[model samples]
Target: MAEVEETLKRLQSQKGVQGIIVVNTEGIPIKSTMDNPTTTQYASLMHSFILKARSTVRDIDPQNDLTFLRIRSKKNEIMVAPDKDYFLIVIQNPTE
Candidate 1:
């Protein structure tokens, strides 16, 4: 969609953003601003991670749901926004 494209473009324009990946529920990359290998790796790994996190949240409270997730590693900050159909992953280097 054009709106999604624009949103991704705007995000990519940000100073700290390293890359962005949009993955479907099946963990397949739909759109990405990173290389092929990197996009595939992140899409698959993050998909499983999100599933685990969501399950954990639901297990804790039946009415609860997973919203957003942020992970800070040594070199990058990985942020994930997950919806019913898609997951938006952003990798940023705040120190840059």
Candidate 2:
């Protein structure tokens, strides 16, 4: 728990980072410093995104790996890293 918090803090230390979250693969929020609804939605989206990414990668190569993902939106940039136990997500302001 403390480690996760430390990681979140470290991520937030970045220039454009706005928030961070750690969630189980099931899209259940574990520890996060964000609004409840936002975290919940992000978790769900992260889970599905990872699934789709993995499937898409598999189409090209059976052992294609998923290490990181960055999604750009009108308002924000979502950075995701899917680990074995949990997903580490960072929301950031896009660099203009």
Candidate 3:
């Protein structure tokens, strides 16, 4: 438990990472990181992206599942996974 907490902190410290979180199959966060005022909107946006990802996968494969979704933008990437009971999401800016 301590190790997981520490790992969350470590991941938050990465150059590109704005936040790192673990959520479940139903999109409930098991753990998360946030320091300022924008957390609510960010969380909402991420959850919406998860819905989009699942729909996209079902459209493409019919029976297959959405293993992951990495939405890359000019400024950052929002990663999502709908299959894991504990899924990781890292919002990262360019690591340069």
Per-candidate alpha-carbon RMSD to the true structure: 2.0, 2.7, 3.5
Deviation in Å, model 2, residue 92 alpha carbon: 1.9
Stronger candidate by lDDT (2 vs 3): 2
Encode model 2's per-residue lDDT on 20-68: one tens digit a residue. 7777766777777777887778777776777788688878997668888
The alpha-carbon deviation from the true structure for residue 53 of candidate 3, after best TM-score superposition, in angstroms, is: 1.7
State the lDDT of candidate 1 residue by residue for 1-96, as single tens digits. Answer: 567556656666457777789887778878887878988887888888878888889989988787788997877888887866677888866555
Model 2, runs deviating above 4 Å: 1-5, 14-17, 94-96
Q: Which candidate number has the best TM-score?
A: 1
Residue 58 C-alpha lDDT in model 3:
85
Q: Model 3, 14-66: lDDT tens per residue? A: 57776766665656566666663345466666777777767877888888887
Which stretch of 10 consecutive residues in model 3 shows the poorest summed lDDT?
79-88
Please rank every candidate by lDDT, starting with the best: 1, 2, 3
- Give all TM-scores, in the order shown: 0.82, 0.75, 0.64
